Amino acid sequence: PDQFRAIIESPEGAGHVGYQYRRNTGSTMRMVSDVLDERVSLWDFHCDPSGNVIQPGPNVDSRQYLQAAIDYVSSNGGGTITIPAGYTWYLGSYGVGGIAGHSGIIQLRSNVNLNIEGRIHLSPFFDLKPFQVFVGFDNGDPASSGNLENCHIYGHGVVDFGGYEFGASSQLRNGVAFGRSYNCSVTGITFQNGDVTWAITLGWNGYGSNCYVRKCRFINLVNSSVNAAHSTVYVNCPYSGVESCYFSMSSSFARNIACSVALHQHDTFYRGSTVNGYCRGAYVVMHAAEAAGAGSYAYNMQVENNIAVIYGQFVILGSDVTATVSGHLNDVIVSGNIVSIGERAAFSAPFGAFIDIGPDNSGASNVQDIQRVLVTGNSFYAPANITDSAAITLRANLNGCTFIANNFDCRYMVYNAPGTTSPVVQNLVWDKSNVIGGTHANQRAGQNLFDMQFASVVNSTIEVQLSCEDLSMFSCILFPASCQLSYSKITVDSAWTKSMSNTAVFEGNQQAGANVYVSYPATVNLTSYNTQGAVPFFSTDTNYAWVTSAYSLSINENLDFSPPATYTNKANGQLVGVGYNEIGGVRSVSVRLMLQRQV
């Protein structure tokens, strides 16, 4: 009767108004409320205890309402909650329960997706405090946490950290901590305007799978000297990665502390992304302390087709150990990336490198087990003034890394600082197809292009090929006497080297070793016997006991004689060859030779 009017204006009203899709007689006879129940938004929970809707804004703490939404949808097996466009939804307090320990604001739950179309902002309650905006753990102790599965965050919206600085270096801040996370992702979202430790973390100590970050943007997420460290996406579960993202920082501190991506477990990737203003591109590291979920090996690591302007190192390789676990890194590919060091003074940020073999956190360089790394088809450029730029800074033990078909245009090709660490190196392979650029030509006074400041080098190949002159460099490659060298191949192509005083330098005459295979140019003075006809020439110096053959790199300006085209040696360390005196007489010549040993 008039009871009907009352029902209709009541909350159950829509449950009494019939609907059948497109008047189709074969369709289900439903009620309007049933169709509206097919979707869900924050508006459906953003109300006071009387059920009246509350408008969001800077004086409203939306946290409890969003939590209620997620908890309720979780209760029905999942779904997608929309965070509506055209509004900014402020968060103003910590969550409670299991996420309390993680300084969590919102607890994510399995199968409950968030479609963020509007903006989520942190209120000043969080200034100078830690926070983790979305947390997937359900326990304060991550080891007793259940899992988070099938949770996807996506949309055109924004998460804005409100510009608040850290209160103390020891604090952590995150956007999305997925936890022990399986089939979770973040797509399309802009994370901005903060001072945080990470924007997103996938996995927890190897527990997790199939977590991805795609088409997101990360903008100005470090802003203070208080911030101890930053990796925008931290990939800590296997079969997981970052694809087609954009990362930008503009603070000075970001140039010293910030890394775009950290890959910490097997079968992870970082691809198709653009970085600007960061210290570092990617960490690729097996931390023993994070090896509980997916084992002790980081393998199948891929960094590909990225574009970066950074201030420190592009890719940092590592592994370490704990009292009970030893970490290992292997089967890595770095390819297709175009990377430059941004304009900066020499030494004004961490040492510029395409690849860095870094020591562990405690600075130890003798714990690493890094091998089967392929670095291929990349471009790297540093401005000419940046003394501290290298294709590779090899500062810790290396068990293998292979470079093929790259283009490196920076100050050093291989570098480690002297005095410092003395890395044990095996299976360092520098193929002849690496092109060494000319930007730093004339800047290398006192310096060695490949500065082999290592404890030892074995089973390695360095094939140096210049593509322009740099007569400022001390040598193309130098081994100090402290570096053992064995079962290696070291060659310097003669092109652009004719005027170099030193090409390859072995300060402990390591090139004499039984299984060292070398070649490089040198200038040699020779004197002949006086005999007319076929006549020997002999080097005046006796430094060539290790030489198997040598050949001329100089023309013969003489008519009446010619020096030998090719030389061998003698037991006293002289070179000897057979030339020709048309007319007799003692000859004396200075010739550029290619010295060869076992090659």
Name the 3-class secondary structure at 82: strand
Which of a copy of itself, Na ion, none has residue 300 at its interface (CB below 5 to 8 Å by kind)? a copy of itself
Q: Give the nearest distance from C-beta 176 to a copy of itself in angstroms.
A: 17
Min. distance of Cβ 418 from a copy of itself in angstroms?
A: 26
Structure tokens at 77: 């097996």
Q: Look up residue 363 and give its two tokens.
A: 């600075």
Q: Of the ranges 96-104, 195-203, 251-259, 326-334, which one interacts with a copy of itself (CB under 8 A)? A: 326-334
Q: How many CA within 13 A on the CB side of residue 293?
A: 26
Check whether 15 is labelled as a binding-site residue: no
Q: Is 167 in the site for a copy of itself (CB under 8 A)?
A: no
* Residues from 20 through 49 that contact a copy of itself (CB under 8 A): 20-24, 26-30, 32-41, 43-47
**Binding of residue 552 to a copy of itself (CB under 8 A):** yes
Closest CB 124 distance from a copy of itself, rounded Å:
22
Residue 484 interacts with a copy of itself (CB under 8 A)?
Answer: no
Among 284, 317, 332, 457, binds a copy of itself (CB under 8 A): 332
Report if residue 149 touches a copy of itself, rule: CB under 8 A.
Answer: no
C-beta of 101: minimal distance to a copy of itself in Å?
A: 26
Among 77, 170, 323, 362, binds a copy of itself (CB under 8 A): 77
By C-beta, is 93 or 482 nearer to Na ion? Answer: 482
Tell me how far apart the alpha carbons of residues 243 and 212 are, in angstroms, rounded to a whole number.
8
In DSSP terms, which residues pair with 538 in a beta bridge? 527, 576
Q: Is 455 in the site for Na ion (CB under 5 A)?
A: yes
Place of tokens 């302007």: 309
Q: Indicate the residue among 171 and 535 with the shorter CB distance to a copy of itself.
A: 535
Residue 273 contacts which entry, Na ion, a copy of itself, none (Cβ below 5-8 A, type-dependent): none
Q: Residues 405, 456, 480, 543: which binds a copy of itself (CB under 8 A)?
A: 405
Asked if 168 is part of the footprint of a copy of itself (rule: CB under 8 A), the reply reads no
455 binds, among Na ion, a copy of itself, none (CB under 5 to 8 A by kind): Na ion
Among 471, 534, 540, 586, binds a copy of itself (CB under 8 A): 534
Give per-residue burial for 408-436: e unless 16+ CB within 10 Å, then b: bbbbbbbbbeeeebbbbbbbbbbeeebeb
- Buried residues in 261-274 as b, exposed as e (16+ CB within 10 A): bbbbbbbbbbbbbe
C-alpha distances out from residue 121 to 84, 192, 194, 302, 439, Å: 13, 10, 11, 34, 45
Residue 300 near residue 268, CB atoms below 8 Å: yes
Query: Does residue 10 belong to the site contacting a copy of itself (CB under 8 A)?
Result: yes
> Which CB atom, from 80 or from 322, has the smaller least distance to a copy of itself?
80
Beta-carbon contacts of 571 under 8 Å, excluding residues fewer than 6 positions away, are 545
Which two structure tokens, joined as six digits, stand for 476? 């193309």
Segment interacting with a copy of itself (CB under 8 A) among 15-23, 135-143, 161-169, 500-508: 15-23
Smallest distance, Å, CB 458 to a copy of itself?
9
In the set 142, 295, 536, 584, which binds a copy of itself (CB under 8 A)? 536
How far is Cα 424 from Cα 366, in angstroms, rounded to an integer?
Answer: 8
Partners of 500 in beta bridges = none
Continuous segment of H or E residues that includes residue 296: none
Alpha-carbon span 1 to 205, nearest angstrom: 64
Q: Could you give the count of Cα atoms lying within 13 Å of 42 in the half-sphere of its Cβ?
A: 26
Contacts of 170 (CB under 8 A, 6+ apart): 228
Chain breaks in the chain (C to N over 2.5 A) after: none
* Residue closer to Na ion, measured from CB, 361 or 482: 482
Q: Which two tokens stand for residue 411?
A: 């100050």
Q: Is 64 in the site for a copy of itself (CB under 8 A)?
A: no
Q: Whose Cβ is closer to Na ion: residue 199's or residue 485's?
A: 485
Whole-angstrom distance, CA of residue 554 vs CA of residue 558:
12
Residues whose CB falls within 8 Å of the CB of residue 9, separated by 6 or more in sequence, listed in order: none
In this complex, which beta carbon is closest to Na ion, that of residue 20 or of residue 482?
482
With CB under 8 A, what is the number of residues at the site for a copy of itself?
168
Q: Choose, by CB under 8 A, the member of 293, 438, 480, 513 that binds a copy of itself.
A: 438
Q: How many CA atoms lie within 13 A of 194 on its CB side?
A: 31
In angstroms, how far apart are the furthest CA atoms of the chain? 136
C-beta atoms surrounding 219 within 10 Å? 18
Question: Among Na ion, a copy of itself, none, what binds residue 305 when CB lies within 5 to 8 Å by partner kind?
Answer: a copy of itself
C-beta of residue 366 within 8 angstroms of C-beta of residue 326: no
Instruction: Return the one option of Na ion, a copy of itself, none that residue 28 interacts with (CB less than 5 to 8 A, by type).
Output: a copy of itself
The residue within the footprint of a copy of itself, chosen from 459, 502, 523, 543 (CB under 8 A), is 459
- Segment 180 to 239, residues that bind a copy of itself, using CB under 8 A: 183, 190, 210, 212, 214-215, 217, 239
Nearest to 289, CA basis, from 328, 330, 321: 321
Shortest distance (Å) from residue 537 CB to Na ion: 38
The residue from 484, 545, 584, 585 that contacts a copy of itself (CB under 8 A) is 545
302 has which bridge partners? 269, 333
- Quick one: 16 or 347, whose CB is closer to a copy of itself? 16
Query: Least distance from C-beta 290 to a copy of itself, angstroms?
Result: 20
Structure tokens at 305: 């087709």
Q: Contact between 100 and Na ion (CB under 5 A)?
A: no
Chain contacts with Na ion (rule: CB under 5 A)? 455, 482, 484
* Binding site as annotated, residues for Ca(2+): 101
